[PDB]
């Protein structure tokens, strides 16, 4: 259920009707809601998607399962419009990879380190932790496997420098 964001990368996505959607290229994040917003897909199925973009974004709420593959709700169908005189019906934000190995700093200006990875809940889509490769010795963040465990609650911006506070 809970794991690291790099796991998404390269995973094939299918629908819950067994139909191939594509391969995850990136993961779209939201600081305001501390959650995954969408998945960026490439090598995407033309039979299902009418589009000329390099990649398409699937909103994260349609994700049902993340295992060896990602299963999403099948939404690649046509609704049928109702006809009044006929019983028949008619038919006619920050990407995760752009945070790669950025520098992480405190509110005062201390250089905390370089971002290594991001911990997320795959069912909920909540962002849980940052994992920062250390460069200085701040006592404000606990450690595991030699990385700073920064609760995402404490992140205050994510532009050219990842900015982090003690609370």
Automatic annotation (TrEMBL):
InterPro entries: PRC-brl_dom, PRC_barrel-like_sf. Residues 5-74 form the PRC-barrel domain. Gene3D superfamilies: PRC-barrel domain (2.30.30.240). PANTHER family: PRC-BARREL DOMAIN PROTEIN (PTHR38137), PRC-BARREL DOMAIN-CONTAINING PROTEIN (PTHR38137:SF1). This is PRC-barrel domain-containing protein.
């Amino acid at each position: 259920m809970i794991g690291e964001i790099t796991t998404f990368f390269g995973m094939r996505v299918f629908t819950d009707e067994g139909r191939y959607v594509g391969r995850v290229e990136d993961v779209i994040l939201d600081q305001n809601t501390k959650s995954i917003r969408g998945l960026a897909i490439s090598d995407y199925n033309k039979a299902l998607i009418d589009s000329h973009a390099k990649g398409v974004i699937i909103p994260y709420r349609v994700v049902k399962a993340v295992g060896d593959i990602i299963i999403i709700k099948d939404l690649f169908k046509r609704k049928s419009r109702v006809l009044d005189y006929e019983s028949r019906e008619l038919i006619e934000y920050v990407p995760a990879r752009s945070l790669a190995r950025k520098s992480v700093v405190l509110t005062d200006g201390t250089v905390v380190g370089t971002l290594y990875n991001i911990t997320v809940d795959f069912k909920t889509g909540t962002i849980v932790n940052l994992l920062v490769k250390p460069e200085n010795e701040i006592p404000d963040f606990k450690k595991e496997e030699g990385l700073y465990i920064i609760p995402f609650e404490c992140v205050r911006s994510l532009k050219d420098f990842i900015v982090v506070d003690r609370r």
